[PDB]
Design a protein around this ligand. Structure first.
Ligand SMILES: [Cl-]
Ligand SMILES: [Cl-]
Ligand SMILES: [Cl-]
Ligand SMILES: [Cl-]
Ligand SMILES: [Mg+2]
Ligand SMILES: [Mg+2]
Ligand SMILES: [Mg+2]
Ligand SMILES: [Mg+2]
Ligand SMILES: [Mg+2]
Ligand SMILES: [Mg+2]
Ligand SMILES: [Mg+2]
Ligand SMILES: [Mg+2]
Ligand SMILES: [Mg+2]
Ligand SMILES: [Mg+2]
Ligand SMILES: [Mg+2]
Ligand SMILES: [Mg+2]
Ligand SMILES: [Mg+2]
Ligand SMILES: [Mg+2]
Ligand SMILES: [Mg+2]
Ligand SMILES: [Mg+2]
Ligand SMILES: [Mg+2]
Ligand code: NA
Ligand code: NA
Ligand code: NA
Ligand code: NA
Ligand code: NA
Ligand code: NA
Ligand code: NA
Ligand code: NA
Lengths: 92, 195, 237
RNA sequence: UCUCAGUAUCGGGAGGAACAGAAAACGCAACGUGAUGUCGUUAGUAACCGCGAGUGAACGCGAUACAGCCCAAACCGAAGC
RNA sequence: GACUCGUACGGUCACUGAAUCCUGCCCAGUGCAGGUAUCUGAACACCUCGUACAAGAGGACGAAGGACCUGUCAACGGCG
RNA sequence: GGAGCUUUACUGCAGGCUGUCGCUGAGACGUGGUCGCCGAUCGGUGACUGCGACUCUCACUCCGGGAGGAGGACACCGAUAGCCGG
């Protein structure tokens, strides 16, 4: 489905309607310094690693919309509930 | 002024530098052709020996002991084991090589008790330690106010009970505070969780 | 499963051992002091139960009596020589350096003074090809060209008992008697005729390997069976 | 993985008890405590854990009993055993 | 340490199963083996960023192995 | 519920192959990098190190009764990493 790159809507920061810009959330890089990272290294050993021997996998046929709404006035972003879309394209 | 002893000490801070390095490279050649346990007439590191209680005196004995480097020489499971218990390669013994050396010396000299020991270095495949042992039955020892404690019956076979300095460190008794909850007073009274 | 037969072998139990106590002599070139020769007389020819090939009893000058690996054409009363200066005749042992290129040779040392290693079995020989102050080139019975120290000693001639394998055993009994004189377990049950527990090829409702026979060099014992690290198989191609 | 469990069992060894023990401690942070063991408590608390099932202290406090010392080296240098 | 008081006319590891006449076609998959410009390929050391240090992020280089190429069926097997 | 067996089931563990560190030393070529001193970003010059190519002997290994010989900083062994591994 298609979506406007920009449209007016409520900014929960400004607390008033503003033109927002919408973009797909790009994944941030892991630092590898998180507690879970330390736990993986510490608890892995001879034999099976328990949860750390698991291999993640699987996909729903259609993912939910994953989006940032950024105010063109105050520059801050907010998040919204997503909805299932096989494809999401922006109209500029 | 500096003792002469401080010079032996200082040399041994860096066994791979200077004259000592040359010495080791020569000596080890002879050591590799020697046995498991060799009584030596004089300590290789005199400062360390005296520091540890050695005296030049009747009933004091020094012996150099060779022990293989690395991890447990371990047989693989012959019956069912969960994966955690199936290891061979990475398993290491809980007693350090130094204590192994001390036990082997003490067995060589059944009448003698282990006072202390120290490192004389290593090649790629083995480590050497010199162990100071004491004759508890010799009256030169029995009359020495500094060493006569070792003559008491309750000091019999001290090395095999972990009462040696290397024994005590290896048992986790170094700290009197935090970290010693499961070591002091003994590994066994704490249920074998200390290490 | 259970350890396979090749694994039982290594344990060195009775069934797999050579009957060593029935063996006669460990055949090695006699040691000569240096820069010398030494002579002996052939006193007898006897059977070598480890080799199914004949062996020669020699009585040497210094009084020493020992069996030696006998090339063809050696007989009682013959005089044999061992050393740098020895004559070039069948049965004499010299360093490869002193031997004429193009002469057939046997009981060749791999390293100087090792008593000899190569070309010791019935009828075989090594062919000495090239000389040098550096290297002696020898062609072994397998056809391989072997670079050797010229100080490696060899015996002149081809090993005795040639043609041993020309005659078929014809029957199980004849094999049997030979196998008693060896470090082998015999007869041989096919892996494919065994149960799965007993061999990688075991099992099934009919006899067949049930996996390719060509096995990797890296395969562990108990798995390494069939055609080991084969570069090819079959006849054609 | 975890759990059963550092259990069963095995190897080595001491004593009438053993081990520990006079701080490179604690860290109710202090102008405070003052070797070690044990008992009661702190507490199923902090901490661990397919953060599942389970696992699980310590400091302190109230008690019991209390005990503090010897080398190595410096400086002497055969005065010694 | 067995093989081995042994040395390729030898040992080992497998398949078939005296003699006789014979034993065709297939290397795509799988296995083994060889080669490999290029691609992929870990850790140490090395370079960059980060951190007064460290965690960590990246880079360069590139072993065996793999991709790719070739050999091989009295290899696993196949012959509609 | 159990066991024996199988495999391109899941997860691991031996074993084999291979890089790397230690044992582990001397000389030296090609090249590149972090670099200091002989010069007024410009070049003769320490050391360090990436890189792939080479020679020694002195550890270590094998042969030899020995004298010595063959190897040689490799291999063995210890540690670790990747691949294969019913
Ligand atoms: Cl989206
Ligand atoms: Cl003792
Ligand atoms: Cl045969
Ligand atoms: Cl307090
Ligand atoms: Mg693991
Ligand atoms: Mg006793
Ligand atoms: Mg107690
Ligand atoms: Mg021999
Ligand atoms: Mg035949
Ligand atoms: Mg007959
Ligand atoms: Mg037999
Ligand atoms: Mg058969
Ligand atoms: Mg059957
Ligand atoms: Mg099987
Ligand atoms: Mg059949
Ligand atoms: Mg068949
Ligand atoms: Mg559950
Ligand atoms: Mg527990
Ligand atoms: Mg505490
Ligand atoms: Mg079952
Ligand atoms: Mg299984
Ligand atoms: Na840990
Ligand atoms: Na003793
Ligand atoms: Na512990
Ligand atoms: Na089969
Ligand atoms: Na767990
Ligand atoms: Na094929
Ligand atoms: Na093929
Ligand atoms: Na069963």
């Amino acid at each position: 489905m298609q979506m406007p790159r920009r449209f007016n809507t409520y900014c929960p920061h400004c607390n008033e309607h503003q033109e927002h810009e919408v973009e797909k959330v790009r994944s941030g890089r892991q630092t590898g310094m998180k507690w879970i990272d330390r736990q993986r290294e510490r608890n892995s050993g001879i034999g099976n690693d328990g949860k750390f021997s698991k291999v993640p996998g699987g996909d729903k046929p259609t993912k939910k919309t994953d989006l940032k709404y950024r105010c063109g006035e105050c520059g801050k972003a907010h998040l919204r509930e997503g909805w299932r879309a096989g494809r999401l394209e922006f109209q500029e | 002024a500096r003792s002469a002893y401080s010079y032996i000490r200082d040399a041994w801070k860096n066994p791979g530098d200077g004259q000592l390095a040359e010495l080791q490279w020569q000596r080890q050649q002879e050591w590799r052709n020697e046995g498991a346990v060799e009584r030596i007439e004089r300590p290789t590191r005199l400062d360390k020996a005296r520091s540890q209680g050695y005296k030049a005196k009747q009933g004091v004995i020094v012996a150099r002991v060779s022990v293989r480097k690395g991890s447990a020489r371990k047989r693989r499971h012959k019956a069912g084991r969960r994966s955690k218990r199936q290891g061979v390669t990475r398993i290491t013994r809980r007693k350090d090589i130094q204590r192994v050396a001390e036990e082997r010396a003490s067995r060589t000299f059944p009448n003698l008790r282990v006072l202390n020991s120290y490192s004389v270095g290593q090649d790629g495949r083995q480590k050497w330690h010199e162990v100071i042992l004491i004759d508890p039955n010799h009256p030169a020892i029995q009359n020495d106010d500094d060493l006569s404690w070792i003559c008491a019956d309750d000091q019999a076979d001290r090395v095999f009970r972990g009462l040696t300095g290397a024994g005590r460190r290896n048992r986790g008794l170094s700290g009197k505070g935090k970290g010693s909850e499961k070591t002091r007073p003994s590994l066994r009274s704490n249920g074998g969780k200390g290490k | 499963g259970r350890r396979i037969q090749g694994q039982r072998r290594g344990r060195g139990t009775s069934t797999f051992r050579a009957p060593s106590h029935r063996y006669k002599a460990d055949l090695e070139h006699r040691k000569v002091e240096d820069g010398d020769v030494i002579a002996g007389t052939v006193v007898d020819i006897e059977h070598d139960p480890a080799r199914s090939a004949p062996v020669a009893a020699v009585e040497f000058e210094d009084g020493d009596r020992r069996l030696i690996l006998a090339p063809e054409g050696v007989g009682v009363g013959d005089e044999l020589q061992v050393g740098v200066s020895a004559e070039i005749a069948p049965g004499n042992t010299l360093p490869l350096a002193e031997i004429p290129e193009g002469v057939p040779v046997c009981n060749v040392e791999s390293s100087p003074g090792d008593g000899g290693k190569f070309a010791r079995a019935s009828g075989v020989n090594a062919q000495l090809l090239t000389h040098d102050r550096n290297v002696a080139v020898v062609k072994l019975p397998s056809g391989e060209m072997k670079r050797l120290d010229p100080q490696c000693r060899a015996t002149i001639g081809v090993v005795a008992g040639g043609g041993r394998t020309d005659k078929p055993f014809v029957k199980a009994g004849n094999k049997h008697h030979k196998m008693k004189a060896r470090g082998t377990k015999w007869p041989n049950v096919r892996g494919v005729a065994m149960n799965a527990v007993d061999h990688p090829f075991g099992g099934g409702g009919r006899q067949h390997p049930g996996k390719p026979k060509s096995i990797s060099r890296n395969a562990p014992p108990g798995r390494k069976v069939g055609d080991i690290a084969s570069k090819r198989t079959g006849r054609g191609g």
